[PDB]
Design a protein around this ligand. Structure first.
Ligand code: FPP
Ligand code: CA
Ligand code: ZN
Lengths: 306, 325
């Protein structure tokens, strides 16, 4: 342990030394690509070395044949993919890939989308990869509807869904292009499946709270939406019975009652705040402030009675 | 549900003497340190700031650090992490924070720093980190914090910068790296700090964002950086500082968080780790100490939630953005 890393250190130190010497000498060649490959594998956050690689690739592009140039970029893609397998959360590595692809005549975007699907099946929460996927989708002019279909299969195949629900929150407005009610109802159905399938799973509850605000007034509640929301309310009460320590369903009961009729449900809303605070005491201060806000809203509604 | 379980013999007292000793001798033990030279300037900033919060700044090497900083400013005006490395907004900010701590801003060429920052703004208002063009709201914060400390916020296109940052606001009230990016505590800190500096906190949904942030607190008392992740002491900074900026610091359980932060100390070596019983480092030492200050620990100087520097320093340069409450 302690010995072998005294060796590694002096290797990285002399290779680092060697790279900086070559750079000061203006030697922008495959030397320096060889040296930095040996350092960036274990230390991808060494930003200056990614810069050195770019300076070399730029220089060589001017002095090499188009086929030699093409060969260097394919080698770079393989290098990059090997680096990502060891450290998939390095800002520098993902940016270098983006820099490289943006430069190309040329680029094979469907292959890059596949790379993304592969990294996301390993870690569905890797934000770097989701950011890269959005980059690739915009470059390839992938339509929001295709990306929407990708997110569905991801949410249903397993949990760890916050990143995929978040992506849906951005896509849905684009394909729209404040959701239309037919879309909102279908989303509510999808999310309500999720949180009844895995009531633990905070991401569906967060997305549902957004959906509850993303509609028309209420009360310009349609009979269909009124009925759907009332149905949700009763389903959450059932889940409360199955899972008495589940705080998300309790909060959602409160929010549904707000969405339906604040004044008619005043009594129940207050009862639910008490239960919820006992179940989730770390959020007592938040919940008291939420209750205070809701009561002030109620006073305004009552004072609107002429 | 992913959480740590704190052990019953976890430290439950603040060990300031040990932390000051740890930071004072950091990088002298010499060591595989070495490794992290690509962030040296920020490392220096973390050490100096935490020492100043603890009243121990004098035990660090002011004259040495000023020569180091001067040697890291490049011809373009930007500052690198270390000698021979390339300039970047991250290390330009750290350098300027250090010089602010030391009331030594004219050690570097301020006009050229301003010109460097100005040069990295894009047409949509965003900022690249350097000439290679990585766009991140981190760099929006670095740009306006650097300029605010220099009295030069007027040098950039502020309305366009605000527009870009607001385009990064999400369904859940938070902010990510770039438009479309998922909410992350780290980016929320950068963005709420940015909006504080530019006087735009009225554009944040404080109740919605505050809720998302307070739901970062796990049963252990520690905070994570997004849903379904493990807690980490540096979120005691990212999350609390954001909550303070938006007037909702009381939405977390302060005693439970304080207990978690104290459990991350190493009682033998000093310093703080990311989680109880892991290896300590200066980054987590600063953020643990700064978190405790936000929570009102008497032995630690009050810390600015926007700049992560002692408030007395910001008062001296007269840069204290108004927060929500
Ligand atoms: C204190 C100060 C003045 C800072 C300057 C601004 C700055 C660099 C903020 C960092 C923001 C952050 C922690 C982002 C997520 O990074 P990550 O990808 O490491 O997050 P993770 O590994 O926890 O997921
Ligand atoms: Ca000294
Ligand atoms: Zn951390």
């Amino acid at each position: 342990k302690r010995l072998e890393r005294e060796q590694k250190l002096k290797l990285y130190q002399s290779a680092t030394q060697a790279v900086f010497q070559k750079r000061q000498a203006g030697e922008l060649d495959e030397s320096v690509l060889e040296l930095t490959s040996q350092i960036l594998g274990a230390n991808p956050d060494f930003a200056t070395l990614w810069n050195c690689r770019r300076e070399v690739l730029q220089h060589l592009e001017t002095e090499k044949s188009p086929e030699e140039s093409a060969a260097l970029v394919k080698a770079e893609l393989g290098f990059l993919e090997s680096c990502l397998r060891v450290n998939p959360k390095s800002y520098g590595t993902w940016h270098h890939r983006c820099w490289l692809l943006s430069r190309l005549p040329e680029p094979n975007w469907a292959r890059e989308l596949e790379l993304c699907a592969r990294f996301l099946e390993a870690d569905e929460r890797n934000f770097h990869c989701w950011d890269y996927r959005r980059f690739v989708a915009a470059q390839a002019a992938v339509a929001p509807a295709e990306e929407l279909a990708f997110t569905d299969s991801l949410i249903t195949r397993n949990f760890s869904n916050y990143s995929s629900w978040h992506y849906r929150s951005c896509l849905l407005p684009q394909l729209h292009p404040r959701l239309p009610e037919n879309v909102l109802l279908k989303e509510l159905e999808l999310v309500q499946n999720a949180f009844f399938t895995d009531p633990n799973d905070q991401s569906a509850w967060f997305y549902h709270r957004w959906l509850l605000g993303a509609g028309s007034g209420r009360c310009e509640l349609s009979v269909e939406k009124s009925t759907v929301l009332q149905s949700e309310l009763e389903s959450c009460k059932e889940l409360q019975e199955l899972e008495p320590e589940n705080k998300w369903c309790l909060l959602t009961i409160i929010l549904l009652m707000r969405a339906l009729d604040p004044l008619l449900y005043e009594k129940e809303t207050l009862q639910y705040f008490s239960t919820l605070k006992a179940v989730d005491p770390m959020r007592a201060a938040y919940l008291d402030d939420l209750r205070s806000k809701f009561l002030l809203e109620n006073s305004v509604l009552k004072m609107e009675y002429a | 549900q992913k959480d740590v379980t704190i052990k019953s013999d976890a430290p439950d007292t603040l060990l300031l003497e040990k932390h000051a000793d740890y930071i004072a001798s950091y990088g002298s033990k010499k060591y595989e340190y070495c490794m992290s030279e690509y962030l040296r300037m920020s490392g220096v900033y973390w050490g100096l700031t935490v020492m100043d919060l603890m009243g121990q700044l004098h035990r660090m090497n002011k004259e040495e650090i000023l020569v180091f900083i001067k040697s890291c400013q490049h011809e373009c005006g930007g500052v690198s992490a270390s000698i021979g490395h390339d300039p970047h907004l991250l290390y330009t900010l750290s350098a300027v924070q250090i010089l602010t701590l030391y009331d030594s801003i004219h050690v570097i060429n301020v006009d050229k720093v301003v010109a460097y920052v100005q040069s990295l703004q894009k047409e949509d208002g965003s900022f690249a980190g350097d000439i290679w063009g990585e766009i991140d709201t981190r760099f929006s914060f670095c740009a306006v914090a650097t300029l605010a400390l220099l009295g030069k916020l007027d040098a950039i296109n502020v309305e366009k910068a605000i527009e870009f940052v607001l385009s990064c606001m999400n369904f859940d009230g938070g902010f990510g790296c770039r438009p479309g990016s998922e909410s992350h505590a780290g980016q929320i800190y950068c963005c709420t700090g940015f909006l504080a500096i530019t006087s735009q906190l009225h554009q944040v949904n404080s109740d919605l964002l505050g809720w998302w942030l307070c739901e970062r607190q796990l049963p252990s008392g520690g905070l994570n950086g997004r849903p379904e992740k493990l807690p980490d002491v540096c979120y005691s900074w990212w999350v609390l500082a954001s909550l303070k900026i938006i007037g909702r610091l009381h939405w977390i359980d302060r005693e439970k968080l304080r207990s978690f932060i104290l459990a991350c100390q190493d009682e033998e070596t000093g310093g703080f780790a990311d989680r109880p019983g892991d290896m300590v480092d200066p980054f987590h030492t600063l953020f643990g100490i700064a978190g405790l200050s936000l929570l009102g620990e008497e032995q630690i100087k009050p810390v600015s939630p926007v700049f992560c520097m002692p408030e007395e320093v910001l008062q001296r340069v007269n840069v204290q953005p108004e927060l929500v409450s």
